[PDB]
Write an enzyme that holds these catalytic residues in place. Sequence first.
Site, PDB file in Angstrom:
ATOM      1  N   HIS A 149       1.423  -7.316  -1.184  1.00  0.00           N
ATOM      2  CA  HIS A 149       0.503  -6.188  -1.343  1.00  0.00           C
ATOM      3  C   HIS A 149       1.322  -4.897  -1.059  1.00  0.00           C
ATOM      4  O   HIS A 149       2.546  -4.946  -0.855  1.00  0.00           O
ATOM      5  CB  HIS A 149      -0.834  -6.319  -0.496  1.00  0.00           C
ATOM      6  CG  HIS A 149      -0.642  -6.223   0.985  1.00  0.00           C
ATOM      7  ND1 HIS A 149      -0.218  -7.301   1.725  1.00  0.00           N
ATOM      8  CD2 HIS A 149      -0.786  -5.195   1.868  1.00  0.00           C
ATOM      9  CE1 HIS A 149      -0.139  -6.958   2.990  1.00  0.00           C
ATOM     10  NE2 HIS A 149      -0.503  -5.704   3.115  1.00  0.00           N
ATOM     11  N   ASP A 174       4.868  -3.019   5.233  1.00  0.00           N
ATOM     12  CA  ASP A 174       5.445  -4.235   5.735  1.00  0.00           C
ATOM     13  C   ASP A 174       5.706  -5.258   4.624  1.00  0.00           C
ATOM     14  O   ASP A 174       6.203  -6.412   4.890  1.00  0.00           O
ATOM     15  CB  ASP A 174       4.617  -4.810   6.918  1.00  0.00           C
ATOM     16  CG  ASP A 174       3.166  -5.037   6.616  1.00  0.00           C
ATOM     17  OD1 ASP A 174       2.567  -4.313   5.806  1.00  0.00           O
ATOM     18  OD2 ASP A 174       2.621  -5.925   7.303  1.00  0.00           O
ATOM     19  N   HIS A 195       1.402  -2.344   1.204  1.00  0.00           N
ATOM     20  CA  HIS A 195       1.640  -1.674   2.451  1.00  0.00           C
ATOM     21  C   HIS A 195       3.110  -1.793   2.770  1.00  0.00           C
ATOM     22  O   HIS A 195       3.793  -2.665   2.216  1.00  0.00           O
ATOM     23  CB  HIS A 195       0.827  -2.307   3.554  1.00  0.00           C
ATOM     24  CG  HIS A 195      -0.625  -1.984   3.500  1.00  0.00           C
ATOM     25  ND1 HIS A 195      -1.587  -2.787   4.080  1.00  0.00           N
ATOM     26  CD2 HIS A 195      -1.292  -0.939   2.966  1.00  0.00           C
ATOM     27  CE1 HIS A 195      -2.777  -2.255   3.900  1.00  0.00           C
ATOM     28  NE2 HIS A 195      -2.629  -1.139   3.227  1.00  0.00           N
ATOM     29  N   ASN A 206      -5.488  -3.975  10.846  1.00  0.00           N
ATOM     30  CA  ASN A 206      -5.479  -2.814  10.011  1.00  0.00           C
ATOM     31  C   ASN A 206      -6.444  -3.177   8.924  1.00  0.00           C
ATOM     32  O   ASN A 206      -6.127  -4.003   8.055  1.00  0.00           O
ATOM     33  CB  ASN A 206      -4.089  -2.532   9.428  1.00  0.00           C
ATOM     34  CG  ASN A 206      -4.120  -1.461   8.325  1.00  0.00           C
ATOM     35  OD1 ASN A 206      -4.937  -0.506   8.357  1.00  0.00           O
ATOM     36  ND2 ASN A 206      -3.237  -1.626   7.329  1.00  0.00           N
ATOM     37  N   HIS A 214      -7.658  -8.508   3.083  1.00  0.00           N
ATOM     38  CA  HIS A 214      -6.931  -7.506   3.820  1.00  0.00           C
ATOM     39  C   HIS A 214      -6.665  -6.226   3.005  1.00  0.00           C
ATOM     40  O   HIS A 214      -6.603  -5.108   3.544  1.00  0.00           O
ATOM     41  CB  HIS A 214      -5.600  -8.179   4.321  1.00  0.00           C
ATOM     42  CG  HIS A 214      -4.611  -7.199   4.873  1.00  0.00           C
ATOM     43  ND1 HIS A 214      -4.646  -6.743   6.178  1.00  0.00           N
ATOM     44  CD2 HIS A 214      -3.632  -6.508   4.258  1.00  0.00           C
ATOM     45  CE1 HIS A 214      -3.703  -5.831   6.353  1.00  0.00           C
ATOM     46  NE2 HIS A 214      -3.064  -5.690   5.201  1.00  0.00           N
TER      47      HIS A 214
HETATM   48  C1  LIG Z   1      -1.281  -4.179  10.857  1.00  0.00           C
HETATM   49  N1  LIG Z   1      -2.379  -4.293  11.612  1.00  0.00           N
HETATM   50  S1  LIG Z   1      -2.514  -3.252  13.000  1.00  0.00           S
HETATM   51  O1  LIG Z   1      -2.065  -1.827  12.785  1.00  0.00           O
HETATM   52  O2  LIG Z   1      -3.995  -3.233  13.260  1.00  0.00           O
HETATM   53  C2  LIG Z   1      -1.836  -3.989  14.372  1.00  0.00           C
HETATM   54  C3  LIG Z   1      -0.930  -3.323  15.218  1.00  0.00           C
HETATM   55  C4  LIG Z   1      -0.431  -3.959  16.365  1.00  0.00           C
HETATM   56  C5  LIG Z   1      -0.841  -5.272  16.618  1.00  0.00           C
HETATM   57  C6  LIG Z   1      -1.750  -5.926  15.788  1.00  0.00           C
HETATM   58  C7  LIG Z   1      -2.248  -5.281  14.658  1.00  0.00           C
HETATM   59  C8  LIG Z   1      -0.327  -3.144  11.021  1.00  0.00           C
HETATM   60  C9  LIG Z   1       0.795  -3.047  10.278  1.00  0.00           C
HETATM   61  C10 LIG Z   1       0.997  -4.028   9.338  1.00  0.00           C
HETATM   62  N2  LIG Z   1       0.076  -5.033   9.191  1.00  0.00           N
HETATM   63  C11 LIG Z   1      -1.068  -5.156   9.861  1.00  0.00           C
HETATM   64  C12 LIG Z   1      -1.941  -6.211   9.507  1.00  0.00           C
HETATM   65  O3  LIG Z   1      -1.670  -6.926   8.506  1.00  0.00           O
HETATM   66  O4  LIG Z   1      -3.071  -6.371  10.033  1.00  0.00           O
HETATM   67 ZN   LIG Z   2      -1.244  -4.611   4.873  1.00  0.00          ZN
HETATM   68 ZN   LIG Z   3       0.511  -6.625   7.808  1.00  0.00          ZN
END
Ligand SMILES: *[C@@]1([N]S(=O)(=O)C2=[C][C]=[C][C]=[C]2)=[C][C]=[C]N=C1C([O])=O
Ligand SMILES: [Zn+2]
Ligand SMILES: [Zn+2]
Length: 231
Positions: free
Chosen positions: A83, A87, A85, A179, A148
């Site tokens: 996807h 990461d 984002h 997120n 997601h």
């Molecule tokens: C996130 N999720 S998040 O920003 O809510 C997060 C941060 C710290 C610990 C747990 C969750 C953030 C960046 C990339 N991916 C995700 C995700 O896939 O939920």
């Molecule tokens: Zn994401």
């Molecule tokens: Zn992620």
Amino acid sequence: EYPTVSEIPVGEVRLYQIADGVWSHIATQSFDGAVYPSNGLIVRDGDELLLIDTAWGAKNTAALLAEIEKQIGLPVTRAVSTHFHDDRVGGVDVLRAAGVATYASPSTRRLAEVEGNEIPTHSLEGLSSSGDAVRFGPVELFYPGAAHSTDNLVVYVPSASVLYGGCAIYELSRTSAGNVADADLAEWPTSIERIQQHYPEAQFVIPGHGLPGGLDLLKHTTNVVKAHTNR
Ligand SMILES: *[C@@]1([N]S(=O)(=O)C2=[C][C]=[C][C]=[C]2)=[C][C]=[C]N=C1C([O])=O
Ligand SMILES: [Zn+2]
Ligand SMILES: [Zn+2]
Ligand SMILES: [Zn+2]
């Protein structure tokens, strides 16, 4: 044995062999004072490698290729971002500069563009409708529906029964939704049920972040998404 946030200095990457010619790649980023790991996949395709997702940024992605070269020593010829984002696409310019052909769905490419993120070069056709599946060398690519994110793909390795869920699948340790700014909370459980209906034989399930498990991670994600929905 599965590498955790502790045994990985930020800027470095560990590989973890899951099966014959399947590895995960694990990296870390610092976000808001916390450090969080991230998983991608590596799947051997004859004498070349298919990379699933970046290692969350340019430096991490350069370290990932150094670490692949060091420890596996076969060339990464293609990469799929699951996807839009960071990461998942952050590091795509690094891949591209190393001669990796970078792929995503048109949906992912449009969103990345809208977002100002890096944009994989090549387009994966035939994934635009929920429940669409296409073969991509040693894997199947699957669009379960919005979860997601609206564009999220999952990856299955038929030869090893490895399902890579990406950020649509949560590790067990994660008991609150993460997120969800770009998430379809209403469709997420339906999307996981498509994944469940399509890959009931999966033995290893790799979440986008954290520890692998079995198909119980789908149910777990369902549970967490539904609780978040009812906050
Ligand atoms: C996130 N999720 S998040 O920003 O809510 C997060 C941060 C710290 C610990 C747990 C969750 C953030 C960046 C990339 N991916 C995700 C995700 O896939 O939920
Ligand atoms: Zn994401
Ligand atoms: Zn992620
Ligand atoms: Zn659970």
